[PDB]
Amino acid sequence: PRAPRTYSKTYSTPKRPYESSRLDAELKLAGEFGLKNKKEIYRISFQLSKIRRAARDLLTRDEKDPKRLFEGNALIRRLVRVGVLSEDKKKLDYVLALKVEDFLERRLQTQVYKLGLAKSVHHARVLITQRHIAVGKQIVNIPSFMVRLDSEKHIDFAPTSPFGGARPGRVARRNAARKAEASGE
Amino acid sequence: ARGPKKHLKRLAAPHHWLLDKLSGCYAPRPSAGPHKLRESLPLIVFLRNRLKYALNGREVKAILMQRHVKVDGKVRTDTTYPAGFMDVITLDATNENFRLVYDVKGRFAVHRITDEEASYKLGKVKKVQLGKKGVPYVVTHDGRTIRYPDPNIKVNDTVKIDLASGKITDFIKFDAGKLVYVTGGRNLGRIGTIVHKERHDGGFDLVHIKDSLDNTFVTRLNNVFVIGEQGKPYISLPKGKGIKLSIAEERDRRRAQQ
Amino acid sequence: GISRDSRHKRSATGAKRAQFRKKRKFELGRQPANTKIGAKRIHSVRTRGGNKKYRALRIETGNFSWASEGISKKTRIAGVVYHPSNNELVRTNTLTKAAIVQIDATPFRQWFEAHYGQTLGKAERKWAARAASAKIESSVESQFSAGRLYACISSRPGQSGRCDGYILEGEELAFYLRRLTAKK
RNA sequence: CUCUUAAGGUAGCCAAAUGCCUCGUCAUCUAAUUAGUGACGCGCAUGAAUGGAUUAACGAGAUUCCCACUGUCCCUAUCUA
RNA sequence: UAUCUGGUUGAUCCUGCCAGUAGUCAUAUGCUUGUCUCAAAGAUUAAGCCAUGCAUGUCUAAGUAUAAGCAAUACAGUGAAACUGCGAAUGGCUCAUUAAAUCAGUUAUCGUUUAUUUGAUAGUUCCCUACAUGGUAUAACUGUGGUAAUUCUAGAGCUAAUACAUGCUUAAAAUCUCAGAUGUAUUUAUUAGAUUGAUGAUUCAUAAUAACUUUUCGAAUCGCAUGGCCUUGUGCUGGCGAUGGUUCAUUCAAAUUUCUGCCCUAUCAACUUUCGAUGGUAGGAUAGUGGCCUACCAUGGUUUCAACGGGUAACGGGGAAUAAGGGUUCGAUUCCGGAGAGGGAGCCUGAGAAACGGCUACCACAUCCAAGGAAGGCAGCAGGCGCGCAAAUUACCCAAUCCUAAUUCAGGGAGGUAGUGACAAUAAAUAACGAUACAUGUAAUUGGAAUGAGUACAAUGUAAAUACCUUAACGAGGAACAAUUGGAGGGCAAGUCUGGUGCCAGCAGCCGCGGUAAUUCCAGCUCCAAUAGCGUAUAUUAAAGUUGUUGCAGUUAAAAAGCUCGUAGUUGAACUUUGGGCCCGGUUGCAACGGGGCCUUUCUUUUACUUUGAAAAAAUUAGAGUGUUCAAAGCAGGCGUAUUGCUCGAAUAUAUUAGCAUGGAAUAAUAGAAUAGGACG
RNA sequence: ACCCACUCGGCACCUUACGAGAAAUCAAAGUCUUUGGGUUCUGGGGGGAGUAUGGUCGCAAGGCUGAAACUUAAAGGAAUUG
RNA sequence: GCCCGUCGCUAGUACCGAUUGAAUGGCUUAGUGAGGCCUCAGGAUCUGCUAGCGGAGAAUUUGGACAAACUUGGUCAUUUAGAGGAACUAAAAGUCGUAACAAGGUUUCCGUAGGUGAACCUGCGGAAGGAUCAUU
Ligand SMILES: [Mg+2]
Ligand SMILES: [Mg+2]
Ligand SMILES: [Mg+2]
Ligand SMILES: [Mg+2]
Ligand SMILES: [Mg+2]
Ligand SMILES: [Mg+2]
Ligand SMILES: [Mg+2]
Ligand SMILES: [Mg+2]
Ligand SMILES: [Mg+2]
Ligand SMILES: [Mg+2]
Ligand SMILES: [Mg+2]
Ligand SMILES: [Mg+2]
Ligand SMILES: [Mg+2]
Ligand SMILES: [Mg+2]
Ligand SMILES: [Mg+2]
Ligand SMILES: [Mg+2]
Ligand SMILES: [Mg+2]
Ligand SMILES: [Mg+2]
Ligand SMILES: [Mg+2]
Ligand SMILES: [Mg+2]
Ligand SMILES: [Mg+2]
Ligand SMILES: [Mg+2]
Ligand SMILES: [Mg+2]
Ligand SMILES: [Mg+2]
Ligand SMILES: [Mg+2]
Ligand SMILES: [Mg+2]
Ligand SMILES: [Mg+2]
Ligand SMILES: [Mg+2]
Ligand SMILES: [Mg+2]
Ligand SMILES: [Mg+2]
Ligand SMILES: [Mg+2]
Ligand SMILES: [Mg+2]
Ligand SMILES: [Mg+2]
Ligand SMILES: [Mg+2]
Ligand SMILES: [Mg+2]
Ligand SMILES: [Mg+2]
């Protein structure tokens, strides 16, 4: 048969299901960032834990070690490119001190709201899901996109999806066709 | 198990072919031939994955059927002909010649050469034996036998092969200070000079190689290929000349084009 | 058939081995040829690789070498007089490697007369050149009076189909005559 | 609880060569068993040197079953003195 | 992400387990189920039994064509059948057997076979054809049939070969025998093979002499072009190939093989050796080594450092889950190796099979029969029965991947595609925004926008599709286009709400609730948790420092043998070159840390250990780069145009058992010279 | 023989514990999460059960070795107050 | 207050058990032994060469080794029936007594032996886990 297909889980559930403080913090994050459920928070914390483990294993190595240098520089480059890690924190010790909100901020659902394209995080969510937002010349209909700190200056409405283009929509068409008859002629 | 295997499942093919994981269940099994199964490079791989001229194995067969491809002077219409080290692939249509050599990463690099030097090839002398009727001969790395060799040619030497008359024109000996290619192991694809040869009678002979960057590595005698003297290779070396830059320096060279 | 594997033939510790890999063709054995004397009957056995072996049964003639002068005459084998491995092969007159047989010796006597001209057992100066260093031995020549030479089979009749050999000499002859006179 | 004895049969064992009822009841053995064996025991009337229980070996002792074997029989016939 | 909590008590601190908790490519099962990608899937119980259909055939220019087959002066094209050759020993499936067996890593073949590929290689053949031999040969074909029945085949008449069997031409030169022989293949003997090739090492390669073969090889083959010279003749020479062929080498392989490493068990301590067990000699057999087998001989071989025996619901490994570290558990299963095709055994062909979609017999099943007989092997693909807690279509296709063949063309249930599919995994619809009233929120007080879930012109995708992307039109107000699964005493987030029942019905993993005041049952409302998922059962992992090497406990909670001796095992006091010093010199900032060279009385026992290097397949893991739209993934891809194109990549680390190479000489062991049989001349 | 002082070895004792322990208490039951001097044996919740079975020893009584099914949320230790 | 055992009922689990019990599988002594292979033969009829002499050769057949399988018996292992026997556990408001916890009213407990409906009693030696750390 053909080679196995690799696949991995992208989240991890909490050890304690019913910790009230964790539940309140998770609900705060979901309300602030307009998240669908706790699985998005779980995914972000899982990614943060993977990054933290990598940075820890690198930090246990001696300084100026070839592997530590290469992999830590690559991880710092990726994090600053995605904009999760600030430009003044390229040390690999502030990587460990990263938080869930740092990743949640670089979300396309967060960035569309922070760029004024939407009135709320939920408005940004529905606008993205409805193909109304284009990152470059490409429609991105997924709230989790991790804008790369250079597409941020390019997040605009799509040529389709009639908030940044020519067409007047689909419900406006039927509304006009009904208003023309309701006018009398 | 009851006879020789004729299939080659994917993920069992040599990794230096850089085959797709999910293209199919099977990989092109190198037919019997001059070099090896592992150390070879099927013409279908060289034509559909390294040159991108053909898109399918059917197109590879179509290319091969019209005598277009030529390996070491002969047509070699075999779809999975085991082309290997120092073999010369020449196509009369799209007339350029490649000498199959190892890049720094140990893959068979696409190395265009000229017609004026595609005529010859190099070959490591695998053995020196007396054949029938007392006629001495040499067996080379590519399974070639050459009768009446120079009486000074020993094992681990290299012989230039005309590849038109199929005869020895020149020979390089194995000695300290000679340019050598690494044809296997971790250092596969590196190029350097012989520093010393530790004997290890009974076991495996070890040879120390020093590249032009003064990096010194030891490797088994089985996978070293003399290619000349330092600064004068008898063949055209690939783009990297077997330097084995570290990963950091490779990243720097990659980022030096912005 | 006959198996040469070590899956039977219990281990050196004495443990009985369980049976895996039911008998394989590449491990096969075959039955002895048990080469007899007279009325040559050689059969071809198709062996591994498409090769061929020759089971010689009932062999009457063989190529025997003197090895003192290098003649290697073809002769008739009379019988088996000694066998280091089994006296039953002597009793049944079975031809096999290392068997002590008696050969006709008349081609060797004829060669000796036509080469030296020295009346072993009863072109002019060639015999003079083959000079007085012509006596062979007091035990190799005393057999010529009876016209039978003790020889040792050197080929494997069941393997090659031939029953070649060499005429015993020196300490080998002395040892084999001592064995013969001890057992007869 | 009574009546009652010198003591009221203990340890054991049993339809046993000791149990009437009785061809006792259950199981096994068999197609079929008043037989045999193993169990049960309010045991007419088992039981401790009137020795109790069990025992390897032994037995021209009594008994049941199985294999072999065969005129014991089916079913008789023939031969010798 | 190195975490605990509830339960023994009137209360306390412990031991200690039960219970809770989270994960599981880990199996079921319940409820629910809208979208995209990805796709496990009759392994567990039965390697149990199988109806039916398919899964291995194959032709070029180049083996054989008189099809009475097609087509417009031998056929010359195509081409049925057949002969011939090759393949059918690959693949795919399954895990039953198997515990030093397989397997893994690592060795050897100076101990062997090797179809095929690639390269090289053969002037030596004959005791009245070579301008080319025979049927001793026949198939298909033609015709006559038998049988109820099978891929049954009989008699008769042809016909060919790269089928079968014979059979010459190659001078020239050349060395021995007394005119002949000396090629190569086989067998034996002998010689050289040095210090005239090679290896660490050979009786190696090779050569030579003498001979020997139920006798090999040394093209009586085929296609396309036909050229040149000349006495123009059936003249003489000369191309490119195909096929075949002896030997060597090579490759694909195979077969043995070195060393080390397997789970539980002593309620297995002795095992093997009569009937080979350990070794020697010789023979036989093998492709070859070898007690592989035989004859003789010897009494050996293994074992508490666990042999041998027994169990495994044991194929081994790469790996998987969980994991602070150490570990624990799993691995039938996408790759590698092994084994098997109902159980055995035997064997033909073939290079390669002890083959099973090959044969033969037995055993067990079981099929058709006209009862005479004949035919069987789904642990291949579908599919059926049975077994069960437990697992899908009797679909399409060779378009990719490759494989096979005479080979570009044909074949392939290999494979791919789709159907079934909440195995598992990735992304994330069920609404968003205003106006108005009340106190940012609320009340079915209203509005205009947006979209895909669907359906569908076309198009893309595809072998044909289907689905995905992209979209003409349609396709929201209860946006009814209505999200569920378990809970609300504690653990553990969420009610002392209302009705019901009243130690009943029931809940409750545990503690417990319910006996008329139920925060626990049955319901309504509300609320909680996760969410297209949630619960339940079993197993396993962490929690478990409740298996403890790290790292447990033993006075009283379970546990110090009644006591001493003592073998194996484990462990074992100290000591032998240290310290001066002068130089050369690398890495991080003149200083530190790291090496080497000299003296200072100083220039090849045995191991363990440790450093570095090769090694440990790929896939998987970690990890670099890369906008699959993100992501799981994949190894892609990227950049200026109207090109007649330039280019980066598919790294790196990891296995430290065992073997190999190498530096060191602390630590631990080992031996030197004592009746000197000692060290240097 | 006795006294004084020291010393080695021994049966123990008193106080205090830096320390240890759950505590009772302990100069070891200390030098243990700052966990490693060497070594032997034993235990893994309570019952079933030191039972059944097998082996072995004994004249016997019994000794040594020694399960499982099943069942249970406690059993137990020290201490406090009644 | 707590509490122990016999006995009686119900349910479940395991054990012993006559039956020279039964079934399955492994191994194996002995006996028989298919089949192919090698081998000693054998000669349908088939064709070549001069009544002869060679070659190919089916049926059949000798002896071997390889050996399935069967029968007999033995042994091992795993399941399983069984009259009867003898325990354990759960549920318990059943019957009898009160053995232990207070000096539990005979201090308790251990080893051993005997006895008794039952817990238990008694003898011998031991322990304090005793109800005594104590009479220079
Ligand atoms: Mg009585
Ligand atoms: Mg009685
Ligand atoms: Mg009786
Ligand atoms: Mg009777
Ligand atoms: Mg009496
Ligand atoms: Mg008597
Ligand atoms: Mg638990
Ligand atoms: Mg199955
Ligand atoms: Mg296979
Ligand atoms: Mg030789
Ligand atoms: Mg031998
Ligand atoms: Mg396993
Ligand atoms: Mg198994
Ligand atoms: Mg496996
Ligand atoms: Mg299984
Ligand atoms: Mg496999
Ligand atoms: Mg097989
Ligand atoms: Mg089956
Ligand atoms: Mg078979
Ligand atoms: Mg089949
Ligand atoms: Mg098959
Ligand atoms: Mg199937
Ligand atoms: Mg809905
Ligand atoms: Mg859609
Ligand atoms: Mg409720
Ligand atoms: Mg709460
Ligand atoms: Mg503990
Ligand atoms: Mg106690
Ligand atoms: Mg205790
Ligand atoms: Mg000792
Ligand atoms: Mg020491
Ligand atoms: Mg316990
Ligand atoms: Mg107490
Ligand atoms: Mg009392
Ligand atoms: Mg009293
Ligand atoms: Mg009392």
Side-chain angles (χ1 to χ4, degrees):
Chain A
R2 196 202 15 91
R5 265 286 217 185
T6 306
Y7 61 84
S8 315
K9 277 221 326 207
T10 62
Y11 72 104
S12 78
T13 56
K15 305 303 186 151
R16 308 176 173 247
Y18 304 126
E19 193 168 6
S20 199
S21 75
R22 192 202 87 243
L23 292 170
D24 294 16
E26 272 159 4
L27 192 56
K28 233 91 71 65
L29 289 182
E32 184 197 339
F33 295 93
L35 310 184
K36 186 206 194 320
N37 48 38
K38 306 298 186 70
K39 201 187 308 159
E40 329 208 316
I41 298 139
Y42 298 163
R43 161 175 62 206
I44 296 302
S45 63
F46 175 79
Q47 297 170 14
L48 182 49
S49 140
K50 261 166 64 177
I51 286 147
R52 213 169 254 152
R53 167 185 341 260
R56 268 193 314 263
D57 198 78
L58 293 175
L59 271 185
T60 81
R61 301 186 149 272
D62 154 28
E63 77 150 42
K64 285 227 86 54
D65 161 278
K67 172 168 212 275
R68 165 186 172 154
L69 270 175
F70 190 90
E71 288 180 342
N73 290 7
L75 175 64
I76 290 164
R77 211 261 309 165
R78 239 146 49 240
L79 286 170
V80 303
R81 176 196 203 194
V82 84
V84 157
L85 181 64
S86 104
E87 256 288 348
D88 282 73
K89 288 167 184 174
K90 296 143 61 55
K91 261 276 191 43
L92 202 71
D93 318 55
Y94 314 107
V95 171
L96 288 185
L98 277 174
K99 328 217 84 65
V100 166
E101 290 98 353
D102 296 329
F103 287 80
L104 286 173
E105 201 79 46
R106 303 314 282 129
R107 259 168 81 83
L108 187 67
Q109 182 185 343
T110 316
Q111 278 316 303
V112 163
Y113 167 62
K114 295 308 173 73
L115 288 185
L117 276 78
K119 275 149 278 315
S120 62
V121 281
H122 309 81
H123 189 61
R125 157 77 66 136
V126 294
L127 241 38
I128 287 167
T129 296
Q130 281 165 349
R131 311 167 64 90
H132 288 318
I133 267 70
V135 153
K137 343 169 189 88
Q138 171 55 55
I139 283 197
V140 175
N141 80 328
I142 315 151
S144 61
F145 179 69
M146 281 327 132
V147 198
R148 272 213 218 101
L149 200 83
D150 277 279
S151 322
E152 202 189 345
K153 284 332 163 285
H154 295 86
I155 299 167
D156 210 305
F157 295 93
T160 36
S161 82
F163 300 138
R167 211 127 155 184
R170 164 191 145 206
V171 339
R173 293 187 145 86
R174 198 187 28 233
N175 258 356
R178 296 156 112 266
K179 224 189 295 283
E181 306 328 280
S183 297
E185 41 98 2
Chain B
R2 278 168 75 215
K5 307 207 163 260
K6 304 155 180 332
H7 289 60
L8 182 64
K9 279 154 160 158
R10 249 172 156 84
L11 318 179
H15 188 89
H16 81 80
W17 302 356
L18 315 168
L19 288 213
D20 187 312
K21 249 175 51 190
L22 322 155
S23 211
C25 288
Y26 304 96
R29 185 166 223 283
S31 313
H35 288 278
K36 222 78 189 193
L37 203 145
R38 321 292 295 166
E39 321 166 339
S40 100
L41 182 65
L43 292 179
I44 172 174
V45 179
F46 180 74
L47 270 175
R48 190 200 33 191
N49 317 123
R50 283 312 182 279
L51 297 189
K52 304 286 280 131
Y53 285 144
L55 296 181
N56 304 342
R58 157 205 80 222
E59 282 179 22
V60 157
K61 194 45 165 175
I63 288 167
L64 282 158
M65 263 309 91
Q66 43 205 21
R67 322 305 269 216
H68 267 150
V69 196
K70 181 185 312 198
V71 186
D72 278 354
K74 338 233 183 175
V75 175
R76 299 317 169 196
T77 88
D78 186 24
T79 305
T80 72
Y81 181 87
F85 193 50
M86 302 261 156
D87 287 1
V88 190
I89 316 289
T90 148
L91 330 117
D92 293 327
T94 97
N95 45 254
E96 64 269 6
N97 308 336
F98 320 83
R99 187 186 298 281
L100 289 193
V101 290
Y102 292 115
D103 50 31
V104 64
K105 238 78 82 172
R107 284 91 48 122
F108 268 129
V110 174
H111 176 42
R112 318 249 169 148
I113 63 178
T114 63
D115 303 43
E116 63 201 317
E117 71 102 355
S119 85
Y120 70 109
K121 96 190 285 315
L122 258 53
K124 176 178 191 188
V125 185
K126 298 309 294 160
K127 81 201 315 184
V128 277
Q129 210 159 351
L130 264 178
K132 292 306 176 212
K133 310 256 187 58
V135 167
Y137 70 110
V138 296
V139 182
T140 69
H141 86 275
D142 62 333
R144 268 171 204 226
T145 165
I146 303 135
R147 299 176 99 210
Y148 315 103
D150 198 297
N152 288 156
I153 293 177
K154 294 322 160 76
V155 183
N156 315 330
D157 300 355
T158 309
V159 286
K160 212 209 263 181
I161 286 138
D162 204 337
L163 178 153
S165 162
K167 287 322 158 229
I168 298 318
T169 72
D170 196 17
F171 75 95
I172 322 156
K173 277 213 88 62
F174 197 95
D175 253 327
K178 304 243 161 281
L179 207 59
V180 285
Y181 223 136
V182 179
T183 50
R186 201 159 101 95
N187 308 304
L188 157 68
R190 289 185 91 164
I191 301 165
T193 78
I194 291 165
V195 180
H196 177 284
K197 171 192 139 204
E198 231 189 336
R199 222 206 296 136
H200 303 141
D201 278 342
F204 290 86
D205 302 54
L206 286 175
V207 46
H208 307 266
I209 327 286
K210 189 168 74 52
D211 64 350
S212 45
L213 281 202
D214 279 295
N215 284 319
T216 340
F217 53 94
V218 69
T219 174
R220 268 191 189 173
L221 193 73
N222 166 81
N223 37 42
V224 292
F225 204 121
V226 190
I227 46 171
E229 194 286 342
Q230 156 65 9
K232 15 168 157 139
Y234 283 27
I235 66 130
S236 40
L237 306 193
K239 207 194 322 298
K241 295 174 190 39
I243 282 316
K244 202 37 173 163
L245 315 154
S246 316
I247 321 312
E249 292 72 328
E250 281 178 49
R251 178 209 48 215
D252 289 349
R253 298 250 189 121
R254 291 269 254 129
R255 262 177 94 272
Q257 285 68 22
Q258 296 277 348
Chain C
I2 298 166
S3 201
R4 302 171 297 103
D5 65 61
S6 270
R7 301 302 174 157
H8 83 284
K9 200 74 208 215
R10 77 207 303 162
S11 78
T13 49
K16 197 271 208 73
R17 296 191 174 113
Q19 179 251 29
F20 108 116
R21 193 175 87 161
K22 85 218 303 165
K23 283 188 186 183
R24 289 290 190 255
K25 206 257 183 194
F26 54 76
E27 290 167 339
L28 70 78
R30 295 194 194 93
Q31 262 159 297
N34 288 314
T35 304
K36 297 318 203 305
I37 282 168
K40 158 189 277 179
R41 170 176 312 179
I42 310 200
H43 293 185
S44 83
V45 173
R46 199 275 203 196
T47 67
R48 187 164 182 95
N51 299 71
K52 204 153 308 315
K53 269 172 197 180
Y54 292 119
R55 295 261 197 280
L57 335 154
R58 306 169 162 210
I59 274 283
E60 43 204 11
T61 37
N63 188 351
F64 289 80
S65 313
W66 203 324
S68 253
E69 290 95 5
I71 312 114
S72 155
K73 288 299 201 220
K74 164 171 178 187
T75 37
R76 228 186 72 256
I77 307 148
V80 177
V81 317
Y82 182 80
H83 201 308
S85 91
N86 196 2
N87 307 324
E88 198 57 37
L89 304 141
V90 178
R91 186 215 287 287
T92 73
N93 290 308
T94 308
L95 299 183
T96 246
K97 185 150 176 300
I100 309 305
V101 298
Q102 288 198 132
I103 59 173
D104 194 8
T106 74
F108 299 107
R109 212 220 324 103
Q110 261 147 54
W111 174 91
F112 192 83
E113 305 284 39
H115 204 264
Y116 302 78
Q118 221 256 338
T119 176
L120 202 44
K122 175 245 284 182
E124 319 103 49
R125 80 262 209 200
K126 273 170 203 173
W127 308 344
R130 295 142 197 186
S133 100
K135 88 76 195 161
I136 38 159
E137 229 202 296
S138 319
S139 303
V140 191
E141 92 177 273
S142 83
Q143 306 161 43
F144 276 99
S145 67
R148 295 272 254 284
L149 284 182
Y150 293 132
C152 190
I153 303 294
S154 319
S155 67
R156 306 184 73 201
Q159 291 307 303
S160 59
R162 326 273 188 92
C163 206
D164 313 353
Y166 65 91
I167 285 141
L168 320 176
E169 291 186 25
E171 259 331 294
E172 183 164 356
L173 195 62
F175 174 85
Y176 280 122
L177 298 138
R178 213 152 67 259
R179 290 287 137 172
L180 287 168
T181 47
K183 285 151 74 50
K184 167 243 287 178

